[PDB]
Amino acid sequence: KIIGSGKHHDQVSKFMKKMFGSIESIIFLEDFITGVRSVEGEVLNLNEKIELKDSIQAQEWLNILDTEIKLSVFTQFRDCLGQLKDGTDIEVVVSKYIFQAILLSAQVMWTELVEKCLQTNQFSKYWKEVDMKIKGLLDKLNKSSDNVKKKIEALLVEYLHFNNVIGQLKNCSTKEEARLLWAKVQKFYQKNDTLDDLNSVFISQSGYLLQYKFEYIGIPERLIYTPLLLIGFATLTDSLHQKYGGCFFGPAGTGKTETVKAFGQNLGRVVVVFNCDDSFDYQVLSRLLVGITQIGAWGCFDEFNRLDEKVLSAVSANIQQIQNGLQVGKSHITLLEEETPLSPHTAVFITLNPGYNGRSELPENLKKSFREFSMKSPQSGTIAEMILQIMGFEDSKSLASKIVHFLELLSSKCSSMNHYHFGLRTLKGVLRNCSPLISEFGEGEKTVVESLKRVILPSLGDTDELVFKDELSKIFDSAGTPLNSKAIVQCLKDAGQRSGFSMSEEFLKKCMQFYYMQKTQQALILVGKAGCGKTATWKTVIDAMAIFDGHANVVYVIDTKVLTKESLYGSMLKATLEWRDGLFTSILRRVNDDITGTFKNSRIWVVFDSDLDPEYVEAMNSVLDDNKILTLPNGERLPIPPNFRILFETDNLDHTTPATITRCGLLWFSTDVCSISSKIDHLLNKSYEALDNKLSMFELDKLKDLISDSFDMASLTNIFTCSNDLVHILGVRTFNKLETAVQLAVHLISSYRQWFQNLDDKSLKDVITLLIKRSLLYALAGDSTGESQRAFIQTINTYFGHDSQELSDYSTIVIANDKLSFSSFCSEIPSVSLEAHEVMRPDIVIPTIDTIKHEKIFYDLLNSKRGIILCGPPGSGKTMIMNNALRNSSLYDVVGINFSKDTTTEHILS
């Protein structure tokens, strides 16, 4: 395509990202090349414009541009260093030069100044000067544009490294210790008396020298400088001095590849990263290796420990060839069945992840040419202080020490739990949530306290909350208060009492915690046993925010485990080469692509309302991370807008990885949000509003008054406590049987509304009480043996009043159209006779008292519009009783599905 693009010369800019790795486009002029621009967005202006005639090949002018960009970077560096040397503020020079040039000029000037400072041992003055520079950069960051903000942040990272080193040098007691510390720190120098400008600047660490190749790097994600990072740099430069390659091994997520890339950036190189175990072809890798050898770039094998055995052997042979050529000093090595030149600036790095067997090591042929090093997670305190210094926090050292001490204290005192993770990741999450809170309250200790209470506190259990509170009081001297209280609390109360929910202290506490957590977090997890109120909590908060802000809400409730990964994320027809959307990506595209609907002024919620497993979430881990992009296995890479928020409603995290818990805002429901006599009232109101559409006014008011005052929690609390004494098959706690009790009671009451108008008040109350007793018995003790059912009947007749009509084992309201009395009866015992030829049909049943009672209760449960579960030993008669109850009626048709050891979800649909 490039070869055929020798006339327009504008199709190369698409592949500039691939062939340069750092620059995304070439900024053109009407017939000249006026510069380049990187992926982050930054105009590098070439000093000498490149003419482009039509006859010139793409190869020739690309070749001249390759040197021109490096010469331009060196020119920017030299101009910036000459400017800063004639003392001028960093703020006025940030706007002129690219990030790399100002970075290198700052590093060289810092090294030059601190050398003489170490000679004279007067560190306080330069430390204060650097601190003032950092404060100036910090205040200029607030007034920065979209492009300059990244550059300012990177310069802040490097300047805080400078100040850290100067402070450590100042604290050193002896000159020997100061020089020991200065040896490890990566120093920068330039030779003022040399030709070949591109080789003027070099880097000295531990006495080893490395040339600075001036390849443009852009404005990359700078890593925070920590004493464990500089040890990685020292190991890499020690390996590179002796021409050995560079191997890192350690736990995943310790930034091995990022450390290699940061080392390359400091040296001015862009590191070509070969990603492994991504169905990575070998031939393309061999081509990349030949390119690395011929150019001289640094190639890093990311996750090298995961490769096919034959592919691993082939690539290890190639790497050994390259390394042998480098060590010997020979040129024109033999690989790819070809002799190719080998530039002596080539280098190979490898990063090995821990496998299933534990530790992973290099192949045998590479162990004699690679110097392995073990990477570890950084110390919490050092980078805690560094991040607090990234923000405008005062007393950042004391704050970081207090935060780390509080976290360790919590880990030592709080009760052990699966999701209790107080490592470095929790610290970084606390700081990231503390970052946006700076707008509301300043950069004091109370901001950290509020972030801790908004991150750690919700995820803690009930017994550990008091520990959190008292340790927070006794560690942090000041305990703050939250703002924006009255308005959102009143709005939550409105949105809850509108839906019937009871605004208890616990429910309001959980709603407030969820609201504050979703204020900043994007991925939410709600954990708690079935019936705690996760759905009620988040729905109430959604309604409250809709009423408060005025933004509309769009909710997509998806059950993850019902749908396979192909349906949830997207399926590709490998035999026909079409990609299908799936469910999650379809509703993401409907958000990004469409604008006619209310999608910019509305908050999108995707509630994964099912148990989560690592396999499902690993396909969206990029969404959970700071990337905030959904990376499909093939297709467009979808950006999630700020309104798009993912919630996870589950009941356990026994299979969710620590990474997902740390990234996602976790809200743990340690107890039910409402008491028994609040769920009962909510269900009563939800049934009254359903009956309201098919009933008169006064009759309904009187009936609901009778239902409400007929039972009281004083008598029912003893019943609910006694129900736990009974043995329950397929046990479910009574807080979940309340729904069945209330719904069945209300339906039974409503089914006899015709016989209530001409009914006396006393008999009406007796009817309501008897039906309530029946519903309570068949909901609480409905899954008992049958003798324990009689025991529960005695309990019911004891704890209710002694005047209401007693409930017997067969007490049923039978109503005759010729009489007005309720006429409650029991124990009919009918009789039936059948012929010989009817002895076995799938619909012949001998009616006994047990059969009639079971059929009656089953039909009453069906008419209550609630699902039923008949649990019993084989041959007991569950199917027979259903089919008899539904054969008599002309309203229901039975569809019998027979589940087996594995009935897929499409069996039911079929």
Partner 1 sequence: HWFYGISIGQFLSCFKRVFIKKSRETRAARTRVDEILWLLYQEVYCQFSTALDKKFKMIMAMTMFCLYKFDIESEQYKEAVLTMIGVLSESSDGVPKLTVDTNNDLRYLWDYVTTKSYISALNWFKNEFFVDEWNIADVVANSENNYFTMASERDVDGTFKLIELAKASKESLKIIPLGSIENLNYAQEEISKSKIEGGWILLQNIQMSLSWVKTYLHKHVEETKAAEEHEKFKMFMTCHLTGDKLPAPLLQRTDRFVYEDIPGILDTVKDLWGSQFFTGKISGVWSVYCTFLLSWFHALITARTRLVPHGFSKKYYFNDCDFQFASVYLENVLATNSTNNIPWAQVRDHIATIVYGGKIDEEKDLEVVAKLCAHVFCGSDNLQIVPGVRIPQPLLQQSEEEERARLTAILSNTIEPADSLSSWLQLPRESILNYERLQAKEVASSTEQLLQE
- Kindly state whether residue 252 participates in binding partner 1, applying the rule CB under 8 A: no
Q: Count the alpha carbons within 13 Å of 20 in the hemisphere toward its beta carbon.
A: 26
Query: From partner 1, ligand ADP, ligand ATP, none, which one binds at residue 848 (CB under 5 to 8 Å depending on kind)?
Result: ligand ADP
Q: Which is nearer to ligand ATP, 533 or 570 (CB)?
A: 533
Q: Which is nearer to Mg ion, 529 or 589 (CB)?
A: 529
Of 627-656, binders to ligand ATP (CB under 6 A) are none
Beta bridge partners of 203: 188, 210
- CA-based diameter of the chain, in Å? 121
- At residue 643, what is the residue type? N
C-beta pairs of 62-70 under 8 Å, 24+ apart in sequence = 62/12, 65/26, 65/33, 65/36, 69/23, 69/36, 69/44, 69/215, 69/216, 70/198, 70/213, 70/214, 70/215, 70/216
Pattern 823-852, ligand ADP, x by CB under 6 A: ----------------------xx-x--x-
Query: From ligand ADP, partner 1, ligand ATP, none, which one binds at residue 372 (CB under 5 to 8 Å depending on kind)?
Result: partner 1
* Pair 47, 71: CB distance under 8 Å: yes
Q: Which positions ≥6 away from 70 have C-beta within 8 Å?
A: 198, 213, 214, 215, 216
Of 216-235, binders to partner 1 (CB under 8 A) are 231, 234-235
How many residues touch ligand ATP under the rule CB under 6 A: the total is: 17
Q: Each residue of 812-830: b (16+ CB within 10 Å) or e?
A: ebeeeeeeeebebeeeeee
In this structure, the number of other CB atoms found within 10 A of the CB of residue 496 comes to 24
- Kindly state whether residue 300 participates in binding ligand ATP, applying the rule CB under 6 A: no
Pattern 492-511, ligand ATP, x by CB under 6 A: ---------xx----x----
Q: Which residues are annotated as a binding site for ATP?
A: 250-257, 528-535, 872-879
Q: How far is the CB of 877 from ligand ADP (least distance, A)?
A: 4
Of 240-269, binders to ligand ATP (CB under 6 A) are none
- Kindly state whether residue 880 participates in binding ligand ADP, applying the rule CB under 6 A: yes
| Structure tokens, 427 | 């610290």
Q: Which is nearer to Mg ion, 113 or 563 (CB)?
A: 563
Q: How far is the CB of 838 from ligand ADP (least distance, A)?
A: 12
Stretch that binds ligand ADP, among 195-203, 299-307, 694-702, 874-882 (CB under 6 A): 874-882
Q: Which positions ≥6 away from 275 have C-beta within 8 Å?
A: 302, 303
Q: What is the DSSP string of 795-811?
A: HHHHHS-SSSPPP-TT-
Determine the 3-state secondary structure of 825 from DSSP.
strand
Q: How far is the CB of 899 from ligand ADP (least distance, A)?
A: 12
- Kindly state whether residue 180 participates in binding partner 1, applying the rule CB under 8 A: yes
Give CA–CA dist 544/550, Å, rounded: 10
Helical residues (DSSP H) of 751-786, grouped into ranges: 761-780
Nearest in space to 614 (alpha carbons), one of 665, 661, 667: 661
Of 536-565, binders to ligand ATP (CB under 6 A) are 536
Q: Which listed residue (280, 428, 877, 886) binds ligand ADP by CB under 6 A?
A: 877
Beta bridge partners of 32: 51
- Kindly state whether residue 653 participates in binding partner 1, applying the rule CB under 8 A: no
Give CA–CA dist 137/150, Å, rounded: 12
Stretch that binds partner 1, among 65-73, 317-325, 599-607, 649-657 (CB under 8 A): 317-325
* Pair 230, 184: CB distance under 8 Å: yes
- Kindly state whether residue 708 participates in binding ligand ADP, applying the rule CB under 6 A: no
Q: Which is nearer to ligand ADP, 596 or 900 (CB)?
A: 900
Give CA–CA dist 674/683, Å, rounded: 12
What Å distances lie between residue 896 and 43, 188, 399, 536, 907, CA to CA?
70, 79, 66, 34, 12
Query: From ligand ADP, Mg ion, ligand ATP, none, which one binds at residue 406 (CB under 5 to 8 Å depending on kind)?
Result: none
- Kindly state whether residue 533 participates in binding ligand ATP, applying the rule CB under 6 A: yes
Q: Which is nearer to partner 1, 334 or 652 (CB)?
A: 334
β-bridge pairing 523-527 and 370-374? unpaired
Q: How far is the CB of 740 from ligand ADP (least distance, A)?
A: 21
Q: Which listed residue (59, 63, 124, 334) binds partner 1 by CB under 8 A?
A: 334
Query: From ligand ADP, partner 1, ligand ATP, none, which one binds at residue 414 (CB under 5 to 8 Å depending on kind)?
Result: none
Q: Which listed residue (19, 466, 530, 555) binds ligand ATP by CB under 6 A?
A: 530
**Phi, then psi, of 439 in degrees rounded to 5:** -65, -40
Q: Which listed residue (876, 888, 889, 903) binds ligand ADP by CB under 6 A?
A: 876
Give CA–CA dist 263/199, Å, rounded: 18
Of 459-518, binders to partner 1 (CB under 8 A) are none
Q: How far is the CB of 389 from ligand ATP (least distance, A)?
A: 42
Give CA–CA dist 433/438, Å, rounded: 10
Direct distance between the N- and C-terminal alpha carbons of the chain, in angstroms, rounded to an integer: 50
Q: Which is nearer to ligand ADP, 306 or 878 (CB)?
A: 878
Determine the 3-state secondary structure of 47 from DSSP.
coil
Of 523-542, binders to Mg ion (CB under 5 A) are 534-535
Q: How far is the CB of 678 from ligand ATP (least distance, A)?
A: 4
- Kindly state whether residue 263 participates in binding partner 1, applying the rule CB under 8 A: no
Angle (nearest 5°) at CA 234 between 231 and 237? 150
Question: What percent of the chain is helix, strand and coil (3-state, nearest 5)?
Answer: 50, 10, 40
* Pair 447, 435: CB distance under 8 Å: no
What Å distances lie between residue 511 and 121, 310, 355, 648, 749, CA to CA?
58, 56, 42, 16, 35
Q: Which is nearer to ligand ATP, 407 or 612 (CB)?
A: 612
Q: Which is nearer to partner 1, 321 or 502 (CB)?
A: 321
C-beta pairs of 121-124 under 8 Å, 24+ apart in sequence = 121/175, 121/178, 123/166, 123/167, 123/169, 123/170, 124/170
Q: Which is nearer to Mg ion, 449 or 544 (CB)?
A: 544
- Kindly state whether residue 500 participates in binding ligand ADP, applying the rule CB under 6 A: no
Query: From ligand ADP, Mg ion, ligand ATP, none, which one binds at residue 880 (CB under 5 to 8 Å depending on kind)?
Result: ligand ADP
Stretch that binds partner 1, among 52-60, 310-318, 549-557, 667-675 (CB under 8 A): 310-318
Query: From ligand ATP, Mg ion, partner 1, none, which one binds at residue 673 (CB under 5 to 8 Å depending on kind)?
Result: ligand ATP
Q: How far is the CB of 534 from Mg ion (least distance, A)?
A: 5
Binding site for Mg ion (CB under 5 A): 534-535
Binding site for partner 1 (CB under 8 A): 176-177, 179-180, 183-184, 206-208, 231, 234-235, 238, 241-242, 244, 250, 310, 313, 317, 320-321, 324, 334, 359, 363-365, 368, 371-374, 376
Residues at the site binding ligand ADP, with contacts judged by CB under 6 A: 845-846, 848, 851, 874-880
Chain residues that interact with ligand ATP, rule: CB under 6 A: 501-502, 507, 528, 530-536, 673-674, 678-679, 682-683
